[PDB]
């Protein structure tokens, strides 16, 4: 695989979003992976609905938290709508997938990257964007303005984000806290520390949507 990977350079990632004051991270995270694989497969880049996931995922807790893998399961079964058809409100209402009409896209499945393994993660990122979790509760993470982030931080993961690339010494992450945070909404986290958990727990649980 390559030394450098950046899905933005292949026209596979959409503008940085802001989840606001709602624990929708898991939905935003899954959506980045969906927008990415569809572009890679079909050639078109569209924004998909995080609100739909927020409302229609029964295994997740709406704005109280949720699971990227379950949100990714939902799309592989029932598909998903465009963000424009089913916009983001920052509050969980009721599932309106049927009302909005036919789904815009549907995935074929979801797979898990072998955990606590930097190589297994890089390999997957070289194929498509990946849903990844980390600990964002630390002040250092919250105050990040740029650079290859090395911490300090623990591995009490509590925020789902998406990995859209990597380099010799970092993993490029797309966050959902707006463009005013980090490097225009992005963060480059240190890799190859030999830490199996990954910086901030980055290697705890990673999933990606499958689509043939
Ligand atoms: C509720 C969890 C299980 C799910 C995750 C992912 O959404 N939640 C979160 O990550 C939550 C979101 C929500 C509660 C406002 N994050 C937060 O509440 C954090 C702040 C807290 C920890 C002091 N949000 C936060 O810090 O806002 C972003 C920001 C900070 C500094 C500069 C620019 C932008």
The Rg value, from CA coordinates, equals 16 Å
> How would a crystallographer describe the biggest sheet?
6 strands, mixed
Distance between the first and last residues' Cα: 21 Å
Shape: globular
State which percent range the strand residues make up: 15-25%
Level-2 CATH architecture: Alpha-Beta Complex
Q: Report the order of strands and helices.
A: EHHHEHEHEEEEE
Number of strands: 8
Q: What is the CATH topology classification name? A: Cathepsin B, Chain A
Helix content estimate: 10-25%
Give the count of structural domains: 1
Tally of DSSP helical segments: 5
> What is the oligomer described by this structure?
monomer
In the CATH hierarchy, what is the superfamily? Cysteine proteinases
Structural class: alpha+beta
Cofactors, ions, other ligands? ligand ALD
CATH class: Alpha Beta
Protein name: Papain
Keywords: Allergen, Disulfide bond, Hydrolase, Protease, Signal, Thiol protease, Zymogen
Function: Cysteine proteinase with a high level of diversity in substrate specificity, an amino acid bearing a large hydrophobic side chain at the P2 position is preferred.
EC number: 3.4.22.2
